[PDB]
Amino acid sequence: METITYVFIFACIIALFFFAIFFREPPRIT
Amino acid sequence: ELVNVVDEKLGTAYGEKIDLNNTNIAAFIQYRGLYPTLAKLIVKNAPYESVEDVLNIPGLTERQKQILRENLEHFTVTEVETALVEGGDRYNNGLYK
Amino acid sequence: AQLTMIAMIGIAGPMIIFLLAVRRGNL
Amino acid sequence: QTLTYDDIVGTGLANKCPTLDDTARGAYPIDSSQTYRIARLCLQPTTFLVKEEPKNKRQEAEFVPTKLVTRETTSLDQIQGELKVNSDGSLTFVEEDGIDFQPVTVQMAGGERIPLLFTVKNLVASTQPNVTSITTSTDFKGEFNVPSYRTANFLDPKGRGLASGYDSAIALPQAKEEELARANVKRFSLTKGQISLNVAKVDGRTGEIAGTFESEQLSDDDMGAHEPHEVKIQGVFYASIEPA
Amino acid sequence: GFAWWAGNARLINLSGKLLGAHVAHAGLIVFWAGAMTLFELAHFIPEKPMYEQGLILIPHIATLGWGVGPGGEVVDTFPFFVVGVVHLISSAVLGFGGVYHAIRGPETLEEYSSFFGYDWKDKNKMTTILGFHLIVLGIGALLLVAKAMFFGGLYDTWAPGGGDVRVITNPTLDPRVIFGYLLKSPFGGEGWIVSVNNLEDVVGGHIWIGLICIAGGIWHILTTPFGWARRAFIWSGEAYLSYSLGALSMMGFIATCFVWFNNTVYPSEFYGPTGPEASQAQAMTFLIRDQKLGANVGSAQGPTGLGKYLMRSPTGEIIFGGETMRFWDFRGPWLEPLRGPNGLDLNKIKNDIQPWQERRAAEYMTHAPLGSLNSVGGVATEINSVNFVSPRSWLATSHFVLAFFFLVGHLWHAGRARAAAAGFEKGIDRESEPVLSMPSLD
Amino acid sequence: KLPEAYAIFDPLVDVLPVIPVLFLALAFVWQAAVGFR
Amino acid sequence: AELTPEVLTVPLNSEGKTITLTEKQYLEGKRLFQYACASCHVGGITKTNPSLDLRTETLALATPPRDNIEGLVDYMKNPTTYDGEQEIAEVHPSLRSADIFPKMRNLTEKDLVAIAGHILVEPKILGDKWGGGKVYY
Amino acid sequence: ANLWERFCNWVTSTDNRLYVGWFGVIMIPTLLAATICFVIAFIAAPPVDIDGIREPVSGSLLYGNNIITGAVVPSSNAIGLHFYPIWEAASLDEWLYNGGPYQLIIFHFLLGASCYMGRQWELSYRLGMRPWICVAYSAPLASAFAVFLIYPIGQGSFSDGMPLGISGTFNFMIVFQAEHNILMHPFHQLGVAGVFGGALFCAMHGSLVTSSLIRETTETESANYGYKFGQEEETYNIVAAHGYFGRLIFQYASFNNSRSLHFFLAAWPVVGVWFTALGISTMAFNLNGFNFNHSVIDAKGNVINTWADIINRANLGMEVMHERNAHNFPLDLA
Amino acid sequence: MEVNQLGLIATALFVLVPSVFLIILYVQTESQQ
Numbered sequence A: 001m002e003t004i005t006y007v008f009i010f011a012c013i014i015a016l017f018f019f020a021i022f023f024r025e026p027p028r029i030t
Numbered sequence B: 001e002l003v004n005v006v007d008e009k010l011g012t013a014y015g016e017k018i019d020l021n022n023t024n025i026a027a028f029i030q031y032r033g034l035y036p037t038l039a040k041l042i043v044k045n046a047p048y049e050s051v052e053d054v055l056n057i058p059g060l061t062e063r064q065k066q067i068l069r070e071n072l073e074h075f076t077v078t079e080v081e082t083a084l085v086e087g088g089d090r091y092n093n094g095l096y097k
Numbered sequence C: 001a002q003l004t005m006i007a008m009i010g011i012a013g014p015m016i017i018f019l020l021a022v023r024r025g026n027l
Numbered sequence D: 001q002t003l004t005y006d007d008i009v010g011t012g013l014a015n016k017c018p019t020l021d022d023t024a025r026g027a028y029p030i031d032s033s034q035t036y037r038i039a040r041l042c043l044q045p046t047t048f049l050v051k052e053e054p055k056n057k058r059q060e061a062e063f064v065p066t067k068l069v070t071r072e073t074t075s076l077d078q079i080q081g082e083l084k085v086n087s088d089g090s091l092t093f094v095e096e097d098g099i100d101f102q103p104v105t106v107q108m109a110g111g112e113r114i115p116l117l118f119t120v121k122n123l124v125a126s127t128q129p130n131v132t133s134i135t136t137s138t139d140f141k142g143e144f145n146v147p148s149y150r151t152a153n154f155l156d157p158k159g160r161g162l163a164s165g166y167d168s169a170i171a172l173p174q175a176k177e178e179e180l181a182r183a184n185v186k187r188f189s190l191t192k193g194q195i196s197l198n199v200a201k202v203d204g205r206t207g208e209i210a211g212t213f214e215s216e217q218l219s220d221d222d223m224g225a226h227e228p229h230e231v232k233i234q235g236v237f238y239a240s241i242e243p244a
Numbered sequence E: 001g002f003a004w005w006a007g008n009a010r011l012i013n014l015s016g017k018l019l020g021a022h023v024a025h026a027g028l029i030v031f032w033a034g035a036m037t038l039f040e041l042a043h044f045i046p047e048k049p050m051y052e053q054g055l056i057l058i059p060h061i062a063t064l065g066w067g068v069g070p071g072g073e074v075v076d077t078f079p080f081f082v083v084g085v086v087h088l089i090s091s092a093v094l095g096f097g098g099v100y101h102a103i104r105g106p107e108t109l110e111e112y113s114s115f116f117g118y119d120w121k122d123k124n125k126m127t128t129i130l131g132f133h134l135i136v137l138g139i140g141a142l143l144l145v146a147k148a149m150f151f152g153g154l155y156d157t158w159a160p161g162g163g164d165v166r167v168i169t170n171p172t173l174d175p176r177v178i179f180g181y182l183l184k185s186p187f188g189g190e191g192w193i194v195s196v197n198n199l200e201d202v203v204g205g206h207i208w209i210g211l212i213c214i215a216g217g218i219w220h221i222l223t224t225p226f227g228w229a230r231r232a233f234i235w236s237g238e239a240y241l242s243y244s245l246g247a248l249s250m251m252g253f254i255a256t257c258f259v260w261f262n263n264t265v266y267p268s269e270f271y272g273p274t275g276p277e278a279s280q281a282q283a284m285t286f287l288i289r290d291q292k293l294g295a296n297v298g299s300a301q302g303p304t305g306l307g308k309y310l311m312r313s314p315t316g317e318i319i320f321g322g323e324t325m326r327f328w329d330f331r332g333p334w335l336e337p338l339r340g341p342n343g344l345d346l347n348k349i350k351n352d353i354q355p356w357q358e359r360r361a362a363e364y365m366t367h368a369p370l371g372s373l374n375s376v377g378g379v380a381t382e383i384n385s386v387n388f389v390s391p392r393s394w395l396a397t398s399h400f401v402l403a404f405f406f407l408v409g410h411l412w413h414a415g416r417a418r419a420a421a422a423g424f425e426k427g428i429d430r431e432s433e434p435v436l437s438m439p440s441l442d
Numbered sequence F: 001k002l003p004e005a006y007a008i009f010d011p012l013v014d015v016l017p018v019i020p021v022l023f024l025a026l027a028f029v030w031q032a033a034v035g036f037r
Numbered sequence G: 001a002e003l004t005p006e007v008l009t010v011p012l013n014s015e016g017k018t019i020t021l022t023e024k025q026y027l028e029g030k031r032l033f034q035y036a037c038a039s040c041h042v043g044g045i046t047k048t049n050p051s052l053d054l055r056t057e058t059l060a061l062a063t064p065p066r067d068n069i070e071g072l073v074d075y076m077k078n079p080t081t082y083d084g085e086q087e088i089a090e091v092h093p094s095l096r097s098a099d100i101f102p103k104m105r106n107l108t109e110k111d112l113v114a115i116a117g118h119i120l121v122e123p124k125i126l127g128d129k130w131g132g133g134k135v136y137y
Numbered sequence H: 001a002n003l004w005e006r007f008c009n010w011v012t013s014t015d016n017r018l019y020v021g022w023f024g025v026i027m028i029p030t031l032l033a034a035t036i037c038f039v040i041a042f043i044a045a046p047p048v049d050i051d052g053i054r055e056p057v058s059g060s061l062l063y064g065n066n067i068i069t070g071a072v073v074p075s076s077n078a079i080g081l082h083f084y085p086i087w088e089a090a091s092l093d094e095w096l097y098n099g100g101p102y103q104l105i106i107f108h109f110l111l112g113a114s115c116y117m118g119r120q121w122e123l124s125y126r127l128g129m130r131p132w133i134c135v136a137y138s139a140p141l142a143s144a145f146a147v148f149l150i151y152p153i154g155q156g157s158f159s160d161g162m163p164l165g166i167s168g169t170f171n172f173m174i175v176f177q178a179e180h181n182i183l184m185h186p187f188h189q190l191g192v193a194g195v196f197g198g199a200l201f202c203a204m205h206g207s208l209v210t211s212s213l214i215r216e217t218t219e220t221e222s223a224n225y226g227y228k229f230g231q232e233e234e235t236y237n238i239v240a241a242h243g244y245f246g247r248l249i250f251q252y253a254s255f256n257n258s259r260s261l262h263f264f265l266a267a268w269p270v271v272g273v274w275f276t277a278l279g280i281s282t283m284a285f286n287l288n289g290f291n292f293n294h295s296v297i298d299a300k301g302n303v304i305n306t307w308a309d310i311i312n313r314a315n316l317g318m319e320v321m322h323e324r325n326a327h328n329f330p331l332d333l334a
Numbered sequence I: 001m002e003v004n005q006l007g008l009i010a011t012a013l014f015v016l017v018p019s020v021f022l023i024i025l026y027v028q029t030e031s032q033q
């Protein structure tokens, strides 16, 4: 169970990486 | 039933004299005339049933016997302990300084 | 002395600058 | 023809015993007067078999194959010793010395690493009576000592040892010791092994012989921590005989 | 447009003052060669091995055959004095030309002579200066061959009988040997060109590079760069500097490894034992000591189940045990007499170890290249007493640091050359900002 | 050591190797004189 | 504490006669020990054979006894094994073997006395440290 | 419009969400290979005989590790600096036992990271920027070369390179301190100064700018909304900031030139980290930290201990214990 | 391994409770604009 927990959290961060890059709030000049 | 044989051996004559069947060779430096020549011979010709057997080591000069004779009283023998004699440990037991 | 020579050598340098600054040269 | 060091190095050939040509089917005669020695004995294993644990009643286990994971570090070589003639015509080889051990780790199906001390230490192997000639049907059978895979100074990962180390589980200061006794008290096994050398090739000119070997020994017991496995080893050997 | 701290950048288009700088700076380099040698000689004491004494120039000279005899004994110090003096004197000549061109000579050269003058963007003129310098360098490499083959020879650590000066009469010409070093892997047991282990190969490689350098020098005076080359490079002085910084960096790293692993052209008699060498030597020392006491070193199982003294390498070769198992690719003159075809031969080990090999192992073991920055010899927990740091640690560390910074210099000037060449090394034009004319990423 | 006929120059030679470092220092005295121009 | 004449007084021979070193001698012997001996014997141990050290008690049990100026001087000229049975000049620096151990070439008879005296004085100053190894650093 | 020119134009396109470029042609694969092998090894690799003594070390979650203790374990001491790709093993089982994944990962990662630095130059050029951000990144990258490659070269073995683990990182630095007394090495001291000072100056600059933001928002909204992306006016008042900081110390200890200030921000940590990378890289060749062991003695010749001697006692306890079954001879020369 | 069995609900709530609070706040921001 502890192995599953560690890998789950890791997996969740990688998925967060994907959304933060590709589905970020786009920066718009002024 | 489960005992540490090396601890157990510290409770024998081994723990107090040079055991001709078990003690590492650097202990022969504690008394004069024994190291390296005689100490080499004693270790190679182990085991011994008695401390007096050492004197019948083929090839002793009369000077060597007299050194052994002087020193008999610092010697002992106990049963060979595999844990102390395997591995070459009577020539190098991994202790230096 | 080693501290004697290295003082004559070490003064050589700043002396070249000094001579040229006090004779307005191509510094 | 022979090879230099720089020819061998890196090839794996350093781990291989010398072969004899397939024409080497002669015989080497023995003069019970003369005395002989094995000047070079080389054992090269090719196969490692471990007995499994069959759990149920009277099934008895099988010798299953294993994968070697420690690479070309397995051969015994440079072994030497008396080759004696006995009253009854048998020959007895007494091992004096040589590179007579290699630690080996093989892996079983399922991932289990099984280490072992592949050895012929103190080997005494004897032939049949009335030899008078070493032929392509001579058999040596013998037995040897298998000392503990680790020797007495070896420290386990919590620092416990036989000739050194802690004598308790120092990280569990107030734990019940009884349950830990098997792991806290190191002991040093010394068991026997058994080997058969089967001569298949003989060069009557040079004294060289070559054949096949099978030995049987125990694996590592981790200084009494667990029960050993039974191990079977097959390979090829080479020896050189000399008048002594 | 440069500040005092980028002040030499002002010399880029001043070819005469820039000659002054380069030639004055060559004189500092020759000066140091000169002075350091005289210093090393003034301090040198021949009863002591060089490597107990802080020497790094004298060992380079000794290695070329001068001043030494059998076994590296120093026989005659006068060649050392000569090398330092001549370098020293020659640095005043370089100093003179140097400051003359930097202060009083023509500021630019291109008006005074179309030959010595240059424009960085003259791809033909740049390749001609390169070609001249290649030829010079090819000559340089042949001078080593000439020494080895006609003027005395070179020190050969591998010479039978302890090492000696030896004339090289059959240099290796076989391109499969010479260029085959260039194709060995840099990894363990291979070592790329650092594995070169005999003077025949050393001398033949220098024949090759001498000719190749002359060929290419000649080539580049006669040609101009082809069009692919024209379109691949930046053509500016700072870009050319950046290329050479890259190369010097690479070369420095190679030298670091050379002095650390190679005991052929960095003989250990002179530079001390290598790290691998010293580690091997300790296993030899205690193997010898213990066998004299009666240990059977081949059958002695160590605590791990591996041999205490001897084990197998991953490909079978009999090798020293303990941690020095990592160092079995080591080869050296004191150890090779024990190698059979399968590695260390156990019968030679029992029977043919010589006093001189026992001495050498003890000496190398006790002069392992470990030491503190204040020159306390030995492991980092050792007490004060021995004043020693191996020349190999000094030469490895120093040149790793210079190699490192010259790679940084390459990046600095390569990046800047690219930007200056395109016109934005001074910043973004507010009115033409490239990004403001691109579509947004999202 | 040095040949005996140059013996007289020992302590000068002990100092010689340091001289290239002084050229670097001398460039900073120069710039101080002219005011870091 | 200081380097008094008592500490500087060491046995000259087995017969029991003694000799009092000057401080100059002691300091010179220390320097010569560093020059010729410390690469193997730093701290009174023996890096290439740790079973034999330079503690006075070990030297007293050596054959020819070496716990004295004469024993040590002789050892530096013609070293033996600990039991006296074999000469070891071929692998141990000595005047007998200065051909192959060139640091011994420039050593005078009084240098050897200084070296010998330093060896005998030092355990009186440092005690267990001298020849004790890393455990006492 | 030629097929190869089209590819070249996609490779260097400034309109890709992540820039590829030529350095990236090498970086993408080698980083993917390193990352995938690492994730799988950290989770499921079996124990690795790091010191070549048939004493395998468990590093993966499935064999009893947690996040803090897990590691991809360095390759076996028996291999040394030999190259151990997969295809040099008899089986993957063997390659796993001997630490092959570690070699795969570190060689791909070092390549990919080196190309990362080049990619930084490259896009700077395509965007019309100045070039030297990659020079700043050379400080971290040199540091990774030190502990993954240079130190293993000098000591003779990838088994002494830094483990890819949190606790293995600590093992590495403890054993480095006993074998090299790195704390007493001035280049480590400068790296501490680059890293403490970088954090200090990070805080300073962020607080001074934050201190002098111009009122653009109400109490009920984040002041961040007072800056709009790509506005031309500065959002803080550096003359107000200079006026505070120069009175906090004295006038000429404060920057009034933003360009010098930010250059200083860049220079200080980059250079201290260069030196500390150089520190590891030169201790790779055993030019160790200062040794003041028994440097003070009294008139008799008694040792008078200093704090350096106390350090030495600790260092000894690290020396005598590390790799406790791996040494047969008295000196740990590598 | 003989881990603390509550380590799991400790970990689950540690992730879940603060995460849900951020998600709630973000979704109600988006449906303001």
Ligand code: CLA
Pocket: C016, C017, C020, C026, C027, E003, E004, E005, E006, E007, E008, E010, E011, E014, E017, E018, E020, E021, E022, E024, E025, E092, E095, E096, E099, E102, E103, F024, F027, F028, F030, F031, F037
């Ligand atoms: C190897 C080091 C080196 C060398 C060779 C040079 C060389 C040069 N520099 Mg650079 N420079 C250096 C280091 C160096 N610099 C460093 C470290 C800095 C930073 C402090 C600078 C900063 C700098 C600036 C700011 C400028 C230069 C300039 C110049 C050039 C003109 C000098 C001039 O007119 O001064 C005149 C100086 C003098 C008249 C003073 C005396 C100098 C003499 C040569 C001292 C020699 C002493 C020696 C013992 C004599 C032995 C003689 C014997 C051999 C006969 C010259 C080619 C200038 C330039 O580019 O012009 C366009 C310029 O503007 N340099």
Ligand code: CLA
Pocket: E019, E023, E090, E093, E094, E096, E097, E098, E100, E101, E105, E106, E109, E112, E113, E116
């Ligand atoms: C690579 C370095 C270099 C370069 C490119 C130049 C280039 C030049 N110099 Mg400078 N110069 C140098 C080094 C250099 N010099 C040195 C070292 C000194 C001091 C010894 C001088 C002193 C000097 C003066 C005093 C003058 C020049 C002038 C000139 C120009 C005319 C050359 C001419 O007509 O001679 C044609 C060539 C020769 C006469 C050379 C003859 C053959 C040479 C001497 C032998 C080859 C040397 C050998 C390869 C290596 C040295 C040996 C060593 C390893 C032991 C030219 C731009 C003149 C100038 O600027 O005009 C006003 C001028 O008046 N030079």
Ligand code: CLA
Pocket: E063, E064, E137, E138, E139, E140, E141, E142, E144, E154, E193, E196, E202, E206, E209, E247, E248, E250, E251, E252, E254, E255, E258, E259, E265
């Ligand atoms: C370029 C190849 C090359 C190589 C591999 C060597 C190698 C060696 N030389 Mg030789 N040497 C060379 C060129 C070379 N030298 C040249 C041109 C000269 C004349 C200047 C000499 C003069 C010379 C002398 C006088 C002596 C040596 C010595 C030595 C040995 C020890 C020094 C050392 O470690 O350097 C290591 C080598 C290097 C750091 C050079 C590496 C070059 C790399 C592999 C190629 C770089 C290419 C470059 C970036 C350009 C690219 C062009 C681009 C368009 C592609 C060593 C075996 C010593 C010796 O042999 O003692 C007996 C000695 O005393 N050499």
Ligand code: CLA
Pocket: E127, E130, E134, E182, E183, E212, E213, E214, E215, E216, E217, E219, E220, E223, E224, E225, E226, E229
């Ligand atoms: C200092 C040395 C030097 C320098 C700086 C140059 C510089 C130059 N050469 Mg010249 N050259 C030299 C020496 C040198 N050359 C010598 C000695 C020879 C004789 C063989 C030549 C032969 C030569 C020819 C025949 C040609 C040039 C050309 C050129 C130009 C293009 C170079 C180029 O594209 O390289 C970049 C290199 C490449 C794109 C491919 C190099 C491939 C190598 C082998 C890969 C190795 C990489 C690896 C990491 C390194 C490890 C070593 C490895 C071999 C194991 C350039 C002006 C070209 C030109 O325009 O001439 C008019 C050309 O066609 N050169």
Ligand code: HEC
Pocket: E362, E363, G033, G036, G037, G038, G039, G040, G041, G046, G048, G049, G052, G053, G054, G055, G058, G059, G062, G066, G072, G075, G076, G080, G081, G082, G088, G092, G093, G115
């Ligand atoms: C510098 C001149 C010295 C001096 C004064 C001594 N040594 Fe050594 N030493 C080394 C080894 C391997 C031994 C043991 C030799 C053996 O018995 O097999 C010794 C022994 C000694 C002793 C005797 C110690 C005792 O208890 O009897 C003495 C007094 C002694 N040495 C003095 C090794 C080395 C070296 C390694 C190369 C070198 C150098 C020295 N010794 C140098 C010196």
Ligand SMILES: CC1=C(/C=C/C(C)=C/C=C/C(C)=C/C=C/C=C(C)/C=C/C=C(C)/C=C/C2=C(C)CCCC2(C)C)C(C)(C)CCC1
Pocket: C009, C010, C011, C012, C013, C014, F016, F019, F022, F023, F025, F026, F028, F029, F032
């Ligand atoms: C070989 C020889 C010779 C030669 C010599 C020479 C070559 C010399 C030179 C020299 C020089 C070349 C010198 C120089 C020096 C310099 C110096 C002395 C410097 C110093 C500096 C300083 C002190 C600094 C300060 C400062 C400033 C100024 C500013 C900024 C800041 C500071 C603080 C840094 C002769 C003839 C003798 C003869 C014999 C032999």
Ligand SMILES: CC1=C(/C=C/C(C)=C/C=C/C(C)=C/C=C/C=C(C)/C=C/C=C(C)/C=C/C2=C(C)CCCC2(C)C)C(C)(C)CCC1
Pocket: E020, E021, E024, E025, E027, E028, E031, E085, E088, E089, E091, E092, E093, E094, E095, E096, E098, E099, E102, F006, F009, F023, F026, F027, F030
């Ligand atoms: C340009 C410039 C610069 C630089 C400069 C230079 C770098 C210079 C060089 C110079 C040089 C580089 C010099 C040289 C000199 C040398 C000399 C002058 C020498 C002499 C010698 C002698 C005198 C000898 C003698 C002897 C003998 C013979 C024997 C032995 C002993 C003796 C040593 C005594 C600067 C930066 C500052 C500034 C700016 C400009």
Ligand SMILES: CC1=C(/C=C/C(C)=C/C=C/C(C)=C/C=C/C=C(C)/C=C/C=C(C)/C=C/C2=C(C)CCCC2(C)C)C(C)(C)CCC1
Pocket: E177, E178, E179, E181, E182, E193, E196, E201, E202, E203, E204, E205, E206, E208, E209, E232
């Ligand atoms: C002498 C000798 C020898 C030999 C040597 C040789 C013969 C050498 C060679 C060497 C060589 C033969 C080298 C080569 C190199 C090259 C290089 C180094 C390259 C470079 C490249 C680059 C740099 C590129 C770049 C680029 C790209 C890639 C893309 C496009 C752009 C550019 C152009 C940038 C020996 C070892 C035997 C021994 C000892 C001595």
Ligand code: OEX
Pocket: E323, H051, H155, H159, H160, H175, H179, H322, H323, H326, H332, H333, H334
């Ligand atoms: O592997 Mn990781 O560690 Ca550098 O020393 Mn030697 O080796 Mn081992 O011992 Mn301490």
Ligand SMILES: [Cl-]
Pocket: H171, H175, H321, H322, H323, H324
């Ligand atoms: Cl450890």
Ligand SMILES: [Cl-]
Pocket: E321, E322, E323, E324, H326, H327, H328, H329
């Ligand atoms: Cl070891």
